[PDB]
């Protein structure tokens, strides 16, 4: 079996930057015979004549989602995570200050989300990408949709305290 | 039969375009009588037979 993965022209140049440090952690290890179709902006991973195809596929799928190489190797290791995308939709008033309430200042509220629930999130101007544990993704998405529905940052910090204690303490 | 009907079409379209050009170029009579003709008719034999069929 093979798999194509489309890539956009806003993660293409950092993929050329990190291109030398993906297939040497892939082809000798998680073999997956690889081409990169620049002719139609896709990456081709076909099977080995000598179920790792899913792992290589969501490896570079997390990369084209736009997560770090540390996170992508943290997807090779620890095969239990989940990537997730959701866009807001809930123009200015409901876009600009809403993503401002997401980021806080300098990504400190996003950093509070991330360090609270052990996930890793990134976001473009409109979308949100969250990867990690499944219940963590559930909880982090709940807190983010709370603060884009409209909640005080101190009150969602209290909810962040509760969920961080719940998902970093056992049971 | 390729070259045969090639030659047949190549003479047919020649005499056809010649006939139509002869029709709607200009027809004055022995005296002054310009002949009424259609916009896209093709043969004096055609207008002759239709003026026969409208007897």
């Amino acid at each position: 079996e093979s798999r194509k993965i489309m890539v956009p022209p806003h993660r293409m140049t950092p993929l050329r930057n990190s291109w030398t440090k993906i297939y040497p952690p892939l082809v000798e290890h998680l073999k997956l015979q690889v081409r990169m179709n620049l002719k139609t902006k896709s990456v081709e991973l076909r099977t080995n004549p000598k179920g790792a195809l899913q792992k290589g596929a969501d490896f570079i799928k997390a990369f084209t989602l736009g997560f770090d190489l540390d996170d992508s190797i943290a997807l090779l290791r620890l095969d239990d995570l989940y990537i997730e995308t959701f866009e807001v939709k809930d123009t200015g008033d409901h876009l600009s200050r809403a993503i401002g309430r997401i980021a806080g200042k300098d990504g400190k509220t996003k950093f509070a989300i991330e360090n609270a629930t052990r996930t890793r999130i990134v976001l473009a101007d409109s979308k949100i990408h969250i990867l990690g544990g499944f219940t963590h993704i559930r909880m982090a998405r709940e807190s983010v949709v709370s603060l884009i529905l409209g909640s005080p940052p101190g009150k969602v910090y209290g909810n962040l305290r509760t969920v961080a204690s719940r998902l970093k303490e056992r049971y | 039969l390729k070259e045969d009907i090639h030659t047949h079409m190549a003479i047919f379209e020649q005499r056809e375009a010649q006939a139509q050009e002869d029709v709607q170029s200009s027809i004055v009579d022995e005296d002054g009588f310009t002949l009424v003709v259609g916009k896209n008719t093709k043969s004096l034999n055609s207008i002759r037979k239709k003026i026969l069929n409208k007897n």
Partner: protein, 118 residues
């Protein structure tokens, strides 16, 4: 070699119905609304409530075994606002991203052709 339902999304105002029926359209599978995913009688047409409604519809749809969907979006039509509401594109997008192939997107809002206002 997939198997297709149709989506029959009704993106009305004040509510959002999504029920994937069979290919004929007769035997419906897993109706949820946008009003049984939040309970406040205000946000029951929200894009977020519609998209999580769509999430658990896709869950029960994969339970049955239907792996792909012809989607038919429907506004309130007729003699009413004739545009799809807030939850339609949200529920379609959620059904797309939650592991379910989508083909033949289609708008089946009922055009009046001179209904009664007079």
């Amino acid at each position: 070699s997939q198997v297709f339902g149709v989506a029959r999304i009704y993106a009305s105002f004040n509510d959002t119905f999504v029920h994937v029926t069979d290919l004929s359209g007769k035997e419906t599978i897993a109706r949820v609304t946008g009003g049984m995913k939040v309970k406040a009688d205000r946000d029951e047409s929200s894009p977020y409530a519609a998209m999580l409604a769509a999430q658990d519809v896709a869950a029960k749809c994969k339970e049955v075994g239907i792996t792909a969907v012809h989607v038919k979006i429907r506004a309130t039509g007729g003699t009413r606002t004739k545009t799809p509401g807030p939850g339609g594109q949200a529920a379609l997008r959620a059904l797309a991203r939650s592991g379910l192939r989508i083909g033949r997107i289609e708008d089946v809002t009922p055009v009046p052709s001179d209904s009664t206002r007079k």
